[PDB]
Structures are given as C-alpha cells and as structure tokens.
Amino acid sequence: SSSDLYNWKNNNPSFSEDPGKLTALIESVLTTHQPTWDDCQQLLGTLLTGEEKQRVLLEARKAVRGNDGRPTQLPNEVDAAFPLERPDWDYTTQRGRNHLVLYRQLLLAGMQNAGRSPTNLAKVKGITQGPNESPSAFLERLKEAYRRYTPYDPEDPGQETNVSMSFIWQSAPDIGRKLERLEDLKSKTLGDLVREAEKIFNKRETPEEREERIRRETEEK
Amino acid sequence: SSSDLYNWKNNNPSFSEDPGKLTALIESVLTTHQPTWDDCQQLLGTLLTGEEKQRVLLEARKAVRGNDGRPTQLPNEVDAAFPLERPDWDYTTQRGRNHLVLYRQLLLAGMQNAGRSPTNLAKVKGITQGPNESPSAFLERLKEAYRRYTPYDPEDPGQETNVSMSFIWQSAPDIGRKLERLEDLKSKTLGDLVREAEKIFNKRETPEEREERIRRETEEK
Amino acid sequence: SSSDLYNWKNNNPSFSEDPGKLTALIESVLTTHQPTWDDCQQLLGTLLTGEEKQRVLLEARKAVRGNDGRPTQLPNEVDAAFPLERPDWDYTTQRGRNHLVLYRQLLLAGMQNAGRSPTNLAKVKGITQGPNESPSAFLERLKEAYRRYTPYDPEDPGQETNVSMSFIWQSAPDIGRKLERLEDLKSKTLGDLVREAEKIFNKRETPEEREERIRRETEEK
Amino acid sequence: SSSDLYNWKNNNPSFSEDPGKLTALIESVLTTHQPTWDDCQQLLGTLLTGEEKQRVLLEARKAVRGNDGRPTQLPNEVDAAFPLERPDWDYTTQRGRNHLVLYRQLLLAGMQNAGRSPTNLAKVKGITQGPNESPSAFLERLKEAYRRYTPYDPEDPGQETNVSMSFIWQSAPDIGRKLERLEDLKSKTLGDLVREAEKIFNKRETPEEREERIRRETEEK
C-alpha cells in the first residue's frame, strides 16, 4: 500500500541523517512483508534518495560471497546474487525463494555497511572529555562513537588498546598527561585507565576548593 | 492489521532506547489481542530488531520454570513452554489455551528481563549530586537509576544499606565526607542520612554569604 | 474500535507519568461511549499497565459507599458495586443501568485517587524559592505542587496555615528567616506573608546596587 | 500411612526451629507422593503447628499470580489458585491435575517465604567477627546469615555494597576502622575488603609478639 511506504518514510529521519532508523525498519519489513525483488525496489526507491540507494546497492553487491564463503567480484556471481535488473525468480519455486532470501539478506548487509559512513574516523576523534565530564561518562560517549561511526566494536578484546589510546589522547589535558606517564602503561586495562583518570578527576580543585586554598595561602602569608 | 503493528512501532522509541515503552505496549496487546504464537512472532518481528528479539527470546526461555517452581534448562521443558519453532497449539482446546497463556507470560518476562540491560552497574554509579542539587532530589534521581538499570527495588528494606552506600559515595564531596564521619553510621537509616546531608547542604555558604563573610573579615582586619 | 483505543493510548503520557491526562480522557469516554463492564476492562487493560490497573481497581473498591454514605469494606457490598469478575448486569434494565452508572463513577474515583500518588509529601517539600524568583511566583509553584501531589486544596481556608508554613520554610533563606521573625506571625494571612516576603525581595541588593555600595564605601573610606 | 507422617515429624526439627528441614522434606513428598488437596492438609496439619500452618497458608496465597504474571489480591483469583476450603478438583481430569500442580507449587512457595522469618534483620546484624576469627571465615558466617535470614543472595552483584557495608561495620573494631579509612573505598570489591582486612589481621601483634615487643622495649630503655 503506498500509505505504508509513505508512512515509513515520513516517520523516520533520512538514511543519511541516521542510517540506523530506516535500516531497522527495512530489516523488519523484509521479514514481515516478505518482499519480492520488485517490492524491494519500491522500498529502496521510496525510502532512500538516489545517492543513498546507489551506495546501498554497491555495498550489497560487495557483500556477495562465493561458494567458498569468501568475497567475490566475479560479475556472474555478483549478478546472480544481487541483480540490478529484474531477475526471473519465481516465488512458487524453492529456487526462487532461496534467491529471494539471499537477496533480502544482502540488501540488509548493504544498508548496514552503507550506513557505516566510511569509518567516521573524524567523529571518533571529535569525542573530547568535557571540563565537568567524569572519565566514565566520557568513555561511554567515546564507545558510542566507535559503535556508530566505525565497524569496530569497542567492547572487543582486540580493540582494547585502540580504545585505550583514544581515551588517553582525548581525555581532558591534565588527565591525559598523567595517564600517559603511568608506570607500566602497557599493562593498564581500559578499566584501570578509567580508575586512574577518576583519581585525577576527583582529587583535583574546585571553586570552593580554590577559596579554601586562597584562605590557607592568606593564613600562610 | 499491519496498520496497528506499524503504528505501534512508529509511536514508540526502539526497545534499546527505552525498553519500558514497547514492553508496556506489548504487555497490553498480549491481553487485549490474545495473540497466537504466530501473532507473537509478528509482534516481535515488527517491533524489535533482530538483536533485540534474540535477547528477548533467550530471556524468555531462561524464565521457564519446572513443575517444582524452579528454573530449568532441560531442553524438553524449555522447548515445551517457549518453542522457537511453530508449536501445534490448538486454541480451541484447553490444552492449547493454557500453553498460549504461559507463552505470553514468558514473552513478557523475557522483555522485562532483556530490558534490565544487564544491571546498568554504570548508570547507577553515574548518578552524582549536582552542586545546587538538594540531597532529597539527588536521592530520588539515584533511586530512579536503581529502578531503571538494576533488578533491585531501592525501596526494599534489604536494599537500604546498598542505596545508603551509593548515596554517601555519590553525594557532593563535602557532604559525603561528613556523612562518612557520622557517629554510629551503621545505625543511620536512608532518611537519617538525607537529614544529615540536608544540614550540611542548607547550613553552608552562598555568594551573598560569601560577601557577608568578606565584609565581616574586612571589619575584623 | 481498536483504532480508538490505541489512538487514545498513543496520544497521551502513561498514567504513571501524568495521571491527569488519561484520567480526563477516560472520564470523557465513560460519558460519550457509555461503556459496559467489559468495555471498561478493555479501556483499563489497554491504557494502563498491569501495576497501574491494579492500583486503580483497589482504589475504586476503596471508594465504595454503603447505603449510609460511608466507606464499607464488606465484601458483598464492595463486590456488588465494583466487581472484579464479569457481573450479570443487563443494560436493557434500569437495574443494570444503575449499576453501570455507579461502576463508571467508581472507576473514575479510583483513577483520581490512584493518581494522587500517595500524597507526594516529597514533591511539595521540594518546591524551593529560586534566587531570582518572586515570592508570588514561588507561591504559585508551591500551590501547584499541593494540587498535583496531595489531596489538599491549597485554596481551602482550612489549609492556609499549612500552606503558610511551607511557604515560610521553603522561601529563600533570607526571606524565610525574616518571615519567621514577624510580629504577630499567627495573625498573618498567606497574602500578608507574600507581601512581607516581597518587601524583603524587592528592597534587597543587586549587582548594580553592589557596585553602588562599593562606590559609596570607597567614597567613605 | 500415618507412620510416614509421624516419622517425618519425629525425624525433623519443628518448622520454627529450622524451616529448611521440613520445607525440603515436604518439597520432596509433594513430588514423590503427588498429594491431593486433602493430602496436603494432612501434611501441613501434621507437620506444622496451628500458627506455622497459618503463616504458610497466607504466604502461599500471597504467592498467587494472575495471568499477567504479577501478584494479585483479587479474592476469586486467590481462592481459585489456593483454596482454603476443599476444592472440586478431579485428578482424573487435566483441569484437576493442573490445579493440583499449581497448588503444590504455591504451597512450596508459601513454606519458603514463611521460613524467611521476616528478613531476620537482627540475625545478620548479630554476626560479629570474633577476636581470633579470620576475615574470610567471618565473611562466610556473614553470608550464611544473609542466606538463612534474608531474601537477599549475598553472592548477587547487586548485593555487593550491602554485604560490604555489613562486613566493614561488623568486622573487629581495629579492622573496621581501617577499612573505613581506605582510599577509594567505593572502588573496593568484597574480595578487596577481605584482603585489606587480612593485612590488618595477619600483620598485628601476638602474646609471643607482645613478649618480643616487651623484650625490645627493655633492651631500648
């Protein structure tokens, strides 16, 4: 029904604004509505701009795997899995159904990867600890940026040193300089670094603490 | 009607954003619409992402109880209560109806527990008293975090020392240091601690009080 | 129509968030739609959570009155007025209609009282005059909290000393200390107290007034 | 057989003395003997005193859940699940059998909760470290009291600060005073606290150590 298509469009941000929204909606519809190849063209054509759809389609074709489970750029294999022109898939046949299943899976992959927005290498670098922001709150914002703007899971054990380095570099300057000077820095987990940053953050100075220090200095000399 | 399903989706945050919203909507629908097992698959499939649904389904299976009222991980019992594949339940039979009742109850449990978001042990620690925030207002925010992000009821008598310790640790530093030094601290109720914190909060200094203190010091010397 | 029920739900906050919203909607519907007992179960079941509905139902049963106009906890009387299980009320009979009228009235009472949220004894105490807030503006916020979070009408003559005491206690500290010291304090109306607080609020000091005082002090010595 | 009933009674402590004993025996019998409602009355009537049985029965009725999986105090629902008077349950019917299953489950719940003995808030506070008792041995006794006399599992992550506070408060006075003074106390796990207490416990003084200190003081002056 065109009312469904337009409602989906109108109740969500554009793909470019926030890819997660439409991707999740389309992932759901791909299941509940079991769209054919033509139906998928209407979905994409209605919910995405020309430039977004193109990104998604190339990303979907890049997600095709050969029978050895590895990527393939062989035209015939790519075309057979994710055709750009109407295929002869017959939904009354197991053959047709299997192609439809795969097509939908690849379409989803395409959207997920096109959303990735080319490892937002700048959005992650732009997460800097605020002057009042606790180290744990800053770390959560930094992890959120990794999730949204990179393909790397900040909770993976293999990403720990990577997240740790961003955490040290992008902490407030006093904190970052002290974390950098920690003894056996290589041995510090992300949790260790947060605890060390908290010691600096919590055992610092405050306007009341500055008034107390000024009073103690005036009592001294 | 697909219009109902999509309306429910579009008028609520995602499950991940705020699990309470969709959980309450689904709890209601489970009653008013008396869904079958297939209907429940459409509900879940339409309102949740693939990753959310999975969490919910495993949480629902973890909520199954044996005839002795205790948890069970026995495949046959788990499968019989909360099947992952279409069951042969016939709604025209008391047997079918009872399974449907239980299934819906477990589905709800699954959502409630999946929402729990693994005892947000960080969200509770992140509630810190603001510099202008009264102790009672801070305590209410702290209790709200316990409710939303842990399975513990902050109003339970058995949670009092737990909430008390968070209250002391996460109060503004001047207040927390004084609460920690209270005589017979073990004997203080949560209400006592709030009253003691209020004494510090209210009998402190203000910019007008600082101007008065500076005037009194200038009158002194 | 399920569209009406779901529209009512989706266009309002939850009962817990703001009880007034749904209570007013349901009060209206109880009149325009003249619901039967089953209809009321759908209303409640759809618009309230399990925990909210329970609160409302117990509150409704607590609102039942005997023939002497007084509360009654006599099971038969409570059950007859507000049955928890489907009653045999026949809307084609004056008997059935009268029970329906009473049921709807009690349902409304239940919601009104369940909303009361147990005399939010903390929300009223949490209304504190802001540093720039006029005494009359503060008093209006304090009265709003009485209305929303207690069963007491702050405009009732019998509540005047009660509101007066909250007004004095929760005024800005300089104001509250002076109001407390007023001669013949017992004789002061709420209006008197507001006028006395205004004298303190308006005849105080300002940054321009502080600059003028500093200039006068520098001219003095 | 009355011999079984009296043997069970005579080979166990009373419910009041140690609820776990009879509860475990009855849980077993409820399974192996598949008792009817009347059989359960004989079990309870024979193994419990009048006052114990009453506690158990009210606790069992308090454990009844509605179809939404939540507690219910609706007379008809409570009565239907756990009747105080002989029900018409026919064990030759699936309907009768299901009620029997539920009844037995609720009976067990009732006993488990009646045993709880109202969160023995005093038994837990009464666990104090002995003068020769190691911190780990004391902690195990403290956890045992939580298990026996509260509904809280001392091994739950959400109970850690609660157990930690009891551990600090009820440690031997020298130990408790030092644990209270630990830097970053909020950051200490239960395991950390035990290790810190062990440092105090093991690096203290002994009668031989006192003789050595007296000899060193006599050598000094």
> What would the two tokens of residue B120 be?
């947000």
Residues of B in contact with C2 (CB under 8 A): 4, 32-33
Longest dimension (CA), chain D: 93
Rounded Cα distance between C92 and A171, Å, is 74
Q: How many CB pairs under 8 A join A and D?
A: 3
User: CA A103 to CA B187: how far, in whole Å?
Assistant: 66
- Which of A23, A136, A208, A219 would you mutate first to test chain B, the one with the most B CBs within 10 A? A208
Are B32 and C10 inside 8 Å of each other by CB? no
How many Å apart are CA D16 and CA D114, to the nearest integer? 9
Tell me the one-letter amino acid at B186: K
Which of D31, D68, D162 is facing B68, going by the closest CB pair? D31
- Asked whether at least 3 C-beta pairs link C and A within 8 Å, the reply is no
Q: Which residues in chain D touch residue B166, judged by CB atoms under 8 angstroms apart?
A: 161
Beta strands (DSSP E) in chain C are none
Find, in chain A, the residue whose alpha carbon is nearest to that of B9. A25
* CB contact D36 to B (< 8 Å): no
Residue B120: exposure state from Cβ atoms within 10 A (0-12, 13-18, ≥19): middle
CA torsion through residues B71, B76, B80, B83, sign: positive
Distance (Å) from the C-alpha of residue B208 to the closest C-alpha of chain C?
Answer: 10
Q: Sign of the C-alpha dihedral, residues C206, C211, C215, C220?
A: positive
CA–CA distance, D156 with A76 (Å, rounded to integer): 57
Quick check: A34 contacting B, CB < 8 Å? no
Which of B4, B136, B208 is nearest residue C122 as measured by Cβ atoms?
B136
**Residue spans of alpha helices (H) in chain B:** 2-10, 19-32, 37-47, 50-61, 75-81, 94-115, 121-125, 135-149, 160-170, 173-180, 190-202, 207-220
C33-to-B32, C27, C43 alpha-carbon distances in Å = 18, 10, 11
Q: What 8-state DSSP symbol labels residue B176?
A: H
Q: What is the token pair recorded at B211?
A: 């101007």
Structure's resolution in angstroms: 6.6
Question: Residues 69-88, chain C: which have Cβ within 8 Å of D?
Answer: 75, 84-85
Nearest CA in chain D to B186: D169
User: A220 vs chain D: nearest CA distance in angstroms?
Assistant: 28
CB-based burial, A38-57: b 16+ in 10 Å, e otherwise: ebbeebbeebbeeebbebbb
C75 CB neighbour count, 10 Å cutoff: 10
User: DSSP secondary structure string, chain D?
Assistant: -HHHHHHHHHTS--TTT-HHHHHHHHHHHHHHT---HHHHHHHHHHHS-HHHHHHHHHHHHTT-B-TTSSB---HHHHHHHS-SS-----TTSHHHHHHHHHHHHHHHHHHHHHHTTTTTHHHHHT----TT--HHHHHHHHHHHHHHHSS--TTSGGGHHHHHHHHHHHS-HHHHHHHHT-TTGGG--HHHHHHHHHHHHHSS--HHHHHHHHHHHHHH-
φ and ψ of B71, to 5 deg: -60, 150
Partner D contacted by B90 (CB < 8 A): no
C-alpha distance from B24 to closest chain C C-alpha (Å): 6
Query: What is the spatial distance between Cα B177 and Cα B197, in angstroms, rounded to a whole number?
Result: 10
C85 contacts on D by Cβ (under 8 Å): 76
The answer for residues whose C-beta is within 8 angstroms of residue D110's C-beta and 6 or more apart is D56, D57, D58, D59, D60, D61, D62, D63, D82
Q: Given CA atoms D215, D216, D219, D221 in this order, what sign does their dihedral have?
A: negative
Q: Are A111 and A23 in contact (CB under 8 A)?
A: yes
C-alpha to C-alpha distance for B196 and B177, rounded to whole angstroms: 12
Concatenated DSSP letters of A115-146: HTTTTTHHHHHT----TT--HHHHHHHHHHHH
Residue that is written with structure tokens 């759901």 in the block:
A28
Half-sphere exposure (Cβ direction) of D171: Cα atoms closer than 13 Å: 27
Whether the Cβ atoms of residue D104 and residue D30 lie closer than 8 Å to each other = yes
Inter-helix orientation angle B2-10/B19-32, to 10°: 150
Number of Cβ atoms within 10 Å of the Cβ of C47: 23
Subunits in contact with chain B (3 or more CB pairs closer than 8 Å): A, C, D
Compute the distance between CA of residue C43 and CA of residue C22 in angstroms, rounded to an integer: 10
